[PDB]
Amino acid sequence: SRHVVICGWSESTLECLRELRGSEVFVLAEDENVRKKVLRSGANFVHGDPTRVSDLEKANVRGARAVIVDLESDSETIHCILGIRKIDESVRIIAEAERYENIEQLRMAGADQVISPFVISGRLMSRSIDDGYEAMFVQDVLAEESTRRMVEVPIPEGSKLEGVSVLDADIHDVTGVIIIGVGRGDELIIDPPRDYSFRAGDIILGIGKPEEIERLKNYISA
Amino acid sequence: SRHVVICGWSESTLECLRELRGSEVFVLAEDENVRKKVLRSGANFVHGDPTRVSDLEKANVRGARAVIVDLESDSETIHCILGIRKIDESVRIIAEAERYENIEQLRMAGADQVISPFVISGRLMSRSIDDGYEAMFVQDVLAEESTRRMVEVPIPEGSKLEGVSVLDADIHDVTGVIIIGVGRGDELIIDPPRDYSFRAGDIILGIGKPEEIERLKNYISALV
Ligand SMILES: [Ca+2]
Ligand SMILES: [Ca+2]
Ligand SMILES: [Ca+2]
Ligand SMILES: [Ca+2]
Ligand SMILES: [Ca+2]
Ligand SMILES: [Cl-]
Ligand code: NA
Ligand code: NA
Ligand code: NA
Ligand code: NA
Ligand code: NA
Ligand code: NA
Ligand code: NA
Ligand code: NA
């Protein structure tokens, strides 16, 4: 599988790096005094300005399967994105937005996915006044350390599930996996209606025990 | 209901403020020049250093139902929490952690809940390499803009659901609401097993359309 490029160094990219152990990752960042922490976290380090195209080419963005961008300001992030788009117009770009008003400029510049940590945080804060169950849920399921995992399971060509409505699929009853969504391309249907019918290519977004996930994979197999 | 206190002014507490319109909110922050923006967002403003116990008392932390803390550094944040605990040992405290290494210290200092935007973000980024469904899910369900809402529904005393296993309740089947979890006290069970039995007081964590939500509400309602 192809390498990932991470542009910029933050607490966010540190956590990303920790989740990307095993994959080949290149971190392109200005601050030299982090080289040791990047290598110790299982990534290659490339000193450079991620807003300069010359430096982006040092990280081989053309041959990257995705680029992750989180620079100190949204203005710097935007320039980085624009730099990437000058080299590879198609490569997948994930970017972090520091400010809500700047999200649309990030998509405009060419980001395929924008994450807004402070918007997520602020909304979780408001749902946490009485008890923190929602914040607990989000923080628990994303952590590949807990008993429940959030998974994306693709429906293979020729699946036993082609043309079967989610009601007929009865996935939670059969496999133990909760279906929270169905996605295809850039669209996600959360809590699909009973009458939606699966196609090969659809991605099931689910939550389950490790054992339940494997059951779902076998259930939807050809 | 009692007021909420927010300590600090950041992109997080701004976004928090937007979700708390209608509620009584007090924002305590050092920079006087954010008053207009705070008042314009439906909160009262209290100029002061949230790390000083005296300034916290201006914000009436004692009678607050929760205090939200997000200061520029974790070091300041901890001091704010320590001050709050000097005033009220029981009040619910929600805090934002800026750095991973500091999370256990915020709890240590007295935070009832710590939210870590950078851990959530870094995890969502790493899950977005192939496709962004998880990020789409987390960000869609929190934005009150779609047809689906994530709700916390309490199980009332005398519910038809007291003592009933989740398998027998079959809540999603009856109401359309996906149950993602059950919570009580400080514990949350995600994707509860078939054999878990509901108690009065448990909080059902779910996702559904408003029509489904209302079905769930009547479904868990009391026996008579
Ligand atoms: Ca960042
Ligand atoms: Ca399960
Ligand atoms: Ca903050
Ligand atoms: Ca994914
Ligand atoms: Ca539903
Ligand atoms: Cl280098
Ligand atoms: Na590696
Ligand atoms: Na490419
Ligand atoms: Na069934
Ligand atoms: Na208000
Ligand atoms: Na009190
Ligand atoms: Na059933
Ligand atoms: Na049904
Ligand atoms: Na059924």
Coordinates of C-alpha atoms and ligand atoms in Angstrom, one line a residue:
Chain A
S1 CA 0.0 0.0 0.0
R2 CA 1.2 3.6 -0.8
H3 CA 2.6 6.0 1.8
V4 CA 0.7 8.8 3.5
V5 CA 2.0 12.3 3.8
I6 CA 1.4 14.4 6.9
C7 CA 2.0 18.2 6.5
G8 CA 2.5 20.1 9.7
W9 CA 3.1 19.0 13.2
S10 CA 0.5 19.2 16.0
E11 CA -1.0 17.2 18.7
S12 CA -3.5 16.1 16.1
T13 CA -0.9 14.7 13.7
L14 CA 0.9 13.0 16.7
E15 CA -2.4 11.1 17.4
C16 CA -2.7 10.3 13.7
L17 CA 0.8 9.0 13.6
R18 CA 0.1 6.8 16.6
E19 CA -2.9 5.3 14.8
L20 CA -0.8 4.8 11.6
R21 CA 1.8 2.6 13.0
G22 CA 2.5 -0.1 10.4
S23 CA 1.8 2.2 7.5
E24 CA 4.5 4.2 5.7
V25 CA 4.2 7.8 6.8
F26 CA 6.1 10.9 5.9
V27 CA 5.8 13.9 8.1
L28 CA 6.8 17.2 6.4
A29 CA 7.1 20.0 8.9
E30 CA 9.1 23.2 9.7
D31 CA 10.0 22.5 13.3
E32 CA 13.3 20.6 13.3
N33 CA 13.1 19.9 17.1
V34 CA 10.5 17.2 16.5
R35 CA 12.5 14.9 14.3
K36 CA 13.2 12.5 17.1
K37 CA 9.5 12.2 18.2
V38 CA 8.4 11.5 14.6
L39 CA 10.9 8.6 14.0
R40 CA 10.1 7.2 17.5
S41 CA 6.5 7.2 16.4
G42 CA 7.2 5.1 13.3
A43 CA 7.3 7.8 10.6
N44 CA 9.9 9.4 8.3
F45 CA 10.7 13.0 8.8
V46 CA 11.3 15.6 6.0
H47 CA 12.2 19.1 7.2
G48 CA 10.5 21.7 5.1
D49 CA 7.8 24.3 4.6
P50 CA 4.7 22.4 3.6
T51 CA 3.4 25.6 1.9
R52 CA 6.3 25.6 -0.6
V53 CA 5.8 23.3 -3.6
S54 CA 9.5 22.3 -3.6
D55 CA 9.1 20.9 -0.1
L56 CA 5.9 19.0 -0.9
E57 CA 7.8 17.3 -3.8
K58 CA 10.4 16.1 -1.2
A59 CA 7.5 14.1 0.5
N60 CA 6.5 12.6 -2.8
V61 CA 2.9 13.8 -2.9
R62 CA 2.4 12.4 -6.4
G63 CA 2.9 8.8 -5.1
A64 CA 1.0 9.4 -1.8
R65 CA -2.3 7.7 -1.3
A66 CA -3.5 10.6 0.9
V67 CA -2.2 13.8 2.4
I68 CA -3.1 15.0 5.8
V69 CA -2.8 18.7 6.5
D70 CA -2.8 20.6 9.8
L71 CA -0.7 23.8 9.8
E72 CA -0.6 26.4 12.5
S73 CA -3.1 28.7 10.9
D74 CA -5.9 28.0 8.5
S75 CA -4.3 30.5 6.1
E76 CA -1.1 28.3 6.1
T77 CA -3.3 25.2 5.7
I78 CA -5.0 26.7 2.7
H79 CA -1.7 27.5 1.0
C80 CA -0.5 24.0 1.6
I81 CA -3.6 22.6 0.1
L82 CA -3.1 24.9 -3.0
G83 CA 0.5 23.6 -3.1
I84 CA -0.6 20.0 -3.2
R85 CA -3.2 20.7 -5.9
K86 CA -0.4 22.2 -8.1
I87 CA 1.4 18.8 -8.0
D88 CA -1.5 16.2 -7.9
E89 CA -5.0 17.4 -8.6
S90 CA -6.6 14.1 -7.7
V91 CA -4.8 12.8 -4.5
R92 CA -7.0 12.7 -1.4
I93 CA -6.5 15.6 1.0
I94 CA -7.7 15.6 4.6
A95 CA -7.4 18.9 6.4
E96 CA -8.0 20.2 9.9
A97 CA -9.8 23.5 10.3
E98 CA -9.0 25.7 13.3
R99 CA -11.9 28.1 12.8
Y100 CA -15.5 27.4 11.7
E101 CA -15.6 30.3 9.3
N102 CA -12.7 28.8 7.4
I103 CA -14.1 25.4 6.6
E104 CA -15.5 26.4 3.2
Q105 CA -12.2 27.9 2.1
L106 CA -10.5 24.6 2.8
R107 CA -12.9 22.6 0.6
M108 CA -12.6 25.4 -2.0
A109 CA -8.9 25.1 -2.0
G110 CA -9.2 21.3 -2.7
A111 CA -9.6 19.5 0.6
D112 CA -11.7 16.4 0.1
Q113 CA -12.4 16.1 3.8
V114 CA -12.2 18.8 6.5
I115 CA -12.1 18.0 10.2
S116 CA -13.2 20.6 12.8
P117 CA -11.9 19.5 16.2
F118 CA -13.0 22.7 18.0
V119 CA -16.5 22.5 16.5
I120 CA -16.7 18.8 17.5
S121 CA -15.4 19.7 20.9
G122 CA -17.7 22.7 21.5
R123 CA -20.8 20.6 20.6
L124 CA -19.7 17.8 22.8
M125 CA -19.2 20.3 25.6
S126 CA -22.9 21.5 25.3
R127 CA -24.1 17.8 25.4
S128 CA -22.0 17.2 28.5
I129 CA -23.8 19.5 31.0
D130 CA -25.8 16.6 32.7
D131 CA -23.6 13.6 31.8
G132 CA -20.9 12.9 29.3
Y133 CA -22.3 9.8 27.6
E134 CA -22.1 11.4 24.1
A135 CA -18.5 12.5 24.6
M136 CA -17.7 9.1 26.1
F137 CA -19.2 7.4 23.0
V138 CA -17.3 9.4 20.4
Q139 CA -14.0 9.1 22.3
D140 CA -14.5 5.4 23.0
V141 CA -15.4 4.1 19.5
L142 CA -12.7 5.9 17.7
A143 CA -10.1 4.3 20.1
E144 CA -9.0 1.0 18.7
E145 CA -8.4 -0.1 22.2
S146 CA -11.9 -0.6 23.4
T147 CA -14.2 -3.6 23.2
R148 CA -16.4 -2.0 20.6
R149 CA -15.0 -0.9 17.2
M150 CA -16.3 1.3 14.5
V151 CA -15.8 -0.4 11.1
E152 CA -16.4 0.3 7.4
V153 CA -17.2 -3.0 5.8
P154 CA -17.5 -3.0 2.0
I155 CA -20.3 -5.0 0.3
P156 CA -18.5 -7.2 -2.2
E157 CA -19.6 -7.8 -5.8
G158 CA -22.0 -10.7 -5.7
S159 CA -22.7 -10.4 -2.0
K160 CA -25.6 -12.3 -0.5
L161 CA -26.8 -8.8 0.3
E162 CA -27.3 -7.2 -3.2
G163 CA -30.9 -6.0 -3.5
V164 CA -31.8 -6.8 0.1
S165 CA -33.5 -4.0 2.1
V166 CA -31.9 -3.2 5.5
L167 CA -35.1 -4.5 7.1
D168 CA -34.6 -7.9 5.4
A169 CA -30.9 -7.8 6.1
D170 CA -31.5 -7.8 9.8
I171 CA -27.8 -7.2 10.3
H172 CA -27.8 -6.5 14.0
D173 CA -29.8 -9.6 14.7
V174 CA -27.7 -11.8 12.5
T175 CA -24.2 -10.5 13.2
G176 CA -24.3 -8.5 16.4
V177 CA -23.0 -5.4 14.5
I178 CA -25.1 -2.2 14.9
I179 CA -25.5 -0.5 11.5
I180 CA -25.1 3.3 11.9
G181 CA -24.8 4.1 8.3
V182 CA -24.4 3.2 4.7
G183 CA -22.1 5.2 2.4
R184 CA -21.1 5.3 -1.2
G185 CA -18.8 7.8 -2.8
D186 CA -18.8 10.9 -0.7
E187 CA -22.3 10.4 0.7
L188 CA -23.3 8.8 3.9
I189 CA -26.8 7.8 5.0
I190 CA -27.0 7.7 8.7
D191 CA -29.7 5.5 10.2
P192 CA -30.9 4.2 6.8
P193 CA -34.7 3.6 6.3
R194 CA -36.1 0.1 6.3
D195 CA -36.6 0.2 2.6
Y196 CA -33.1 1.1 1.4
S197 CA -31.6 -1.7 -0.7
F198 CA -27.9 -2.6 -0.6
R199 CA -25.7 -2.6 -3.7
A200 CA -22.3 -4.0 -4.3
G201 CA -19.9 -1.1 -3.6
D202 CA -22.0 0.3 -0.7
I203 CA -20.1 0.6 2.6
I204 CA -21.6 -0.4 5.8
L205 CA -20.6 1.7 8.7
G206 CA -21.1 -0.3 11.9
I207 CA -20.1 -0.8 15.6
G208 CA -19.4 -4.1 17.1
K209 CA -17.2 -6.5 19.0
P210 CA -14.2 -7.9 17.0
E211 CA -16.0 -11.2 16.8
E212 CA -19.2 -9.6 15.5
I213 CA -17.3 -7.8 12.7
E214 CA -15.9 -11.0 11.4
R215 CA -19.4 -12.5 11.4
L216 CA -20.7 -9.6 9.3
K217 CA -17.9 -10.0 6.8
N218 CA -18.8 -13.6 6.3
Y219 CA -22.5 -12.8 6.2
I220 CA -22.1 -10.3 3.4
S221 CA -19.6 -12.4 1.5
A222 CA -20.4 -14.1 -1.8
Chain B
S1 CA -32.6 25.3 36.1
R2 CA -29.2 26.6 37.4
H3 CA -26.8 28.5 35.2
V4 CA -23.8 27.1 33.4
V5 CA -20.3 28.6 33.7
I6 CA -17.9 28.7 30.9
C7 CA -14.3 29.6 31.7
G8 CA -12.1 30.9 28.9
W9 CA -12.8 32.1 25.4
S10 CA -11.8 29.9 22.4
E11 CA -13.2 28.4 19.2
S12 CA -14.5 25.6 21.4
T13 CA -16.4 27.6 23.9
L14 CA -17.8 29.8 21.1
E15 CA -19.2 26.8 19.5
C16 CA -20.5 25.6 22.8
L17 CA -22.2 28.9 23.4
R18 CA -24.0 28.5 20.1
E19 CA -25.6 25.2 21.3
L20 CA -26.6 26.7 24.6
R21 CA -28.8 29.5 23.4
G22 CA -31.8 29.9 25.7
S23 CA -29.9 28.6 28.7
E24 CA -28.4 30.9 31.4
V25 CA -24.7 31.0 30.7
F26 CA -21.8 32.9 32.2
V27 CA -18.5 33.4 30.4
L28 CA -15.5 34.3 32.6
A29 CA -12.5 35.5 30.6
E30 CA -9.5 37.7 30.9
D31 CA -9.8 39.7 27.7
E32 CA -12.4 42.5 28.2
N33 CA -12.6 43.0 24.5
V34 CA -14.7 39.8 23.9
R35 CA -17.7 41.1 25.8
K36 CA -19.6 42.2 22.7
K37 CA -19.1 38.9 21.0
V38 CA -20.1 37.0 24.2
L39 CA -23.2 39.1 24.8
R40 CA -24.1 38.8 21.1
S41 CA -24.0 35.0 21.6
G42 CA -26.6 34.8 24.4
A43 CA -24.4 34.6 27.4
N44 CA -23.5 36.9 30.3
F45 CA -19.8 38.0 30.5
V46 CA -17.6 38.3 33.6
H47 CA -14.2 39.9 33.2
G48 CA -11.7 38.1 35.4
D49 CA -8.8 35.6 35.5
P50 CA -10.5 32.2 35.7
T51 CA -7.4 30.9 37.6
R52 CA -8.2 33.3 40.5
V53 CA -10.7 31.9 43.1
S54 CA -12.0 35.4 43.6
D55 CA -13.0 35.8 39.9
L56 CA -14.6 32.4 39.8
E57 CA -16.8 33.5 42.7
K58 CA -18.0 36.4 40.6
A59 CA -19.3 33.8 38.1
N60 CA -21.2 32.1 40.9
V61 CA -19.5 28.7 40.5
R62 CA -21.2 27.5 43.7
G63 CA -24.7 27.5 42.2
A64 CA -23.7 26.4 38.7
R65 CA -25.0 23.1 37.4
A66 CA -21.8 22.6 35.4
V67 CA -18.6 24.5 34.7
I68 CA -16.9 24.2 31.3
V69 CA -13.2 25.0 31.3
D70 CA -11.0 25.7 28.3
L71 CA -8.0 27.9 28.9
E72 CA -5.1 28.6 26.5
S73 CA -2.8 26.1 28.2
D74 CA -3.4 22.9 30.2
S75 CA -1.4 24.5 33.0
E76 CA -3.9 27.3 33.3
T77 CA -6.7 24.9 32.9
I78 CA -5.6 22.7 35.8
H79 CA -5.3 25.8 38.1
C80 CA -8.8 26.9 37.1
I81 CA -10.1 23.4 38.0
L82 CA -8.2 23.4 41.3
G83 CA -9.7 26.7 42.1
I84 CA -13.2 25.5 41.3
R85 CA -12.7 22.5 43.6
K86 CA -11.8 24.8 46.5
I87 CA -15.2 26.5 46.1
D88 CA -17.3 23.5 45.2
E89 CA -16.1 19.9 45.6
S90 CA -19.2 18.4 43.9
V91 CA -19.9 20.6 40.8
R92 CA -19.7 18.9 37.4
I93 CA -16.6 20.1 35.6
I94 CA -16.0 19.5 31.9
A95 CA -12.5 20.5 30.6
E96 CA -10.7 20.7 27.3
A97 CA -7.2 19.2 27.1
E98 CA -4.8 20.8 24.8
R99 CA -2.1 18.1 25.0
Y100 CA -2.3 14.3 25.3
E101 CA 0.3 14.0 28.1
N102 CA -1.9 16.3 30.3
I103 CA -5.2 14.4 30.2
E104 CA -4.7 12.3 33.3
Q105 CA -3.7 15.4 35.2
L106 CA -6.9 17.2 34.4
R107 CA -8.9 14.3 35.9
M108 CA -6.4 14.3 38.7
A109 CA -7.0 17.9 39.3
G110 CA -10.8 17.3 39.5
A111 CA -12.3 17.3 36.0
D112 CA -15.4 15.1 35.7
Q113 CA -14.9 14.8 32.0
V114 CA -12.1 15.7 29.7
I115 CA -12.7 16.3 26.0
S116 CA -9.6 16.0 23.7
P117 CA -10.3 17.6 20.3
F118 CA -6.8 16.7 19.0
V119 CA -7.2 13.0 19.9
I120 CA -10.6 12.9 18.3
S121 CA -9.2 14.8 15.2
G122 CA -6.1 12.7 14.8
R123 CA -8.2 9.6 15.0
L124 CA -10.7 10.9 12.5
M125 CA -7.8 11.9 10.1
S126 CA -6.3 8.4 10.3
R127 CA -9.7 6.9 9.5
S128 CA -10.1 9.3 6.6
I129 CA -7.3 8.0 4.4
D130 CA -9.5 5.8 2.3
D131 CA -12.9 7.4 2.9
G132 CA -14.4 9.8 5.4
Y133 CA -17.5 8.0 6.6
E134 CA -16.5 8.1 10.3
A135 CA -15.7 11.8 10.1
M136 CA -19.0 12.3 8.2
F137 CA -20.8 10.4 10.9
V138 CA -19.3 12.2 13.9
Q139 CA -19.7 15.6 12.4
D140 CA -23.2 15.0 10.9
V141 CA -24.8 13.6 14.1
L142 CA -23.5 16.5 16.2
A143 CA -24.8 19.1 13.7
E144 CA -28.5 19.6 14.5
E145 CA -29.2 20.1 10.8
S146 CA -30.1 16.7 9.5
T147 CA -33.3 14.6 10.0
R148 CA -31.4 12.4 12.5
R149 CA -30.6 13.5 16.0
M150 CA -28.6 11.8 18.7
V151 CA -30.5 11.8 22.0
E152 CA -30.1 10.8 25.6
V153 CA -33.4 9.3 26.8
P154 CA -33.8 8.5 30.5
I155 CA -35.6 5.3 31.6
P156 CA -38.4 6.5 33.9
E157 CA -39.3 4.9 37.2
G158 CA -41.9 2.1 36.6
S159 CA -41.0 1.8 32.9
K160 CA -42.4 -1.1 30.9
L161 CA -38.7 -1.6 30.3
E162 CA -37.5 -2.2 33.9
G163 CA -35.9 -5.6 34.1
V164 CA -36.3 -6.2 30.4
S165 CA -33.3 -7.4 28.4
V166 CA -32.2 -5.5 25.4
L167 CA -32.9 -8.5 23.3
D168 CA -36.5 -8.6 24.5
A169 CA -36.9 -4.9 24.3
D170 CA -35.8 -4.9 20.7
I171 CA -35.9 -1.1 20.8
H172 CA -34.7 -0.4 17.3
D173 CA -37.2 -2.9 15.9
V174 CA -40.1 -1.3 17.7
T175 CA -39.2 2.4 17.5
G176 CA -36.7 2.9 14.7
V177 CA -34.2 4.5 17.2
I178 CA -30.7 2.9 16.9
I179 CA -29.4 2.2 20.4
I180 CA -25.7 3.0 20.4
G181 CA -25.4 2.8 24.2
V182 CA -26.8 2.6 27.7
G183 CA -25.4 4.7 30.5
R184 CA -25.7 5.0 34.3
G185 CA -23.6 6.9 36.8
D186 CA -20.2 7.4 35.2
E187 CA -20.4 4.3 33.0
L188 CA -21.4 3.9 29.4
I189 CA -22.0 0.6 27.7
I190 CA -21.6 0.8 23.9
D191 CA -23.6 -1.8 21.8
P192 CA -25.0 -3.5 24.9
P193 CA -25.2 -7.3 24.8
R194 CA -28.5 -9.1 24.3
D195 CA -28.7 -10.0 28.0
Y196 CA -28.2 -6.6 29.6
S197 CA -31.4 -5.7 31.5
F198 CA -32.6 -2.1 31.7
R199 CA -33.0 -0.5 35.1
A200 CA -34.9 2.7 36.0
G201 CA -32.3 5.5 35.8
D202 CA -30.3 4.1 32.9
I203 CA -29.9 6.5 30.0
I204 CA -30.5 5.3 26.5
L205 CA -28.2 6.8 24.0
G206 CA -29.8 6.7 20.5
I207 CA -30.0 7.9 17.0
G208 CA -33.2 8.3 15.1
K209 CA -35.6 10.7 13.3
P210 CA -37.9 12.8 15.5
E211 CA -40.8 10.6 14.7
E212 CA -38.8 7.6 15.9
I213 CA -37.7 9.4 19.0
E214 CA -41.3 10.1 20.0
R215 CA -42.1 6.4 19.5
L216 CA -39.2 5.5 21.8
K217 CA -40.4 8.0 24.5
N218 CA -43.9 6.4 24.6
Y219 CA -42.3 2.9 24.4
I220 CA -40.2 3.3 27.5
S221 CA -42.9 5.1 29.4
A222 CA -44.3 3.9 32.7
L223 CA -46.7 1.0 33.5
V224 CA -49.9 1.8 35.3
Ligands
CA1 CA -4.3 21.7 14.6
CA2 CA -23.1 -6.1 19.4
CA3 CA -9.0 25.2 23.5
CA4 CA -12.3 5.1 7.0
CA5 CA -34.3 4.9 12.2
CL6 CL 15.2 16.0 5.8
NA7 NA 6.1 2.7 9.3
NA8 NA -1.5 10.0 -6.8
NA9 NA -35.5 -9.7 13.6
NA10 NA -28.8 32.9 27.6
NA11 NA -23.4 23.6 44.7
NA12 NA -35.1 -8.4 16.7
NA13 NA -40.1 -3.3 13.4
NA14 NA -38.2 -7.1 13.2

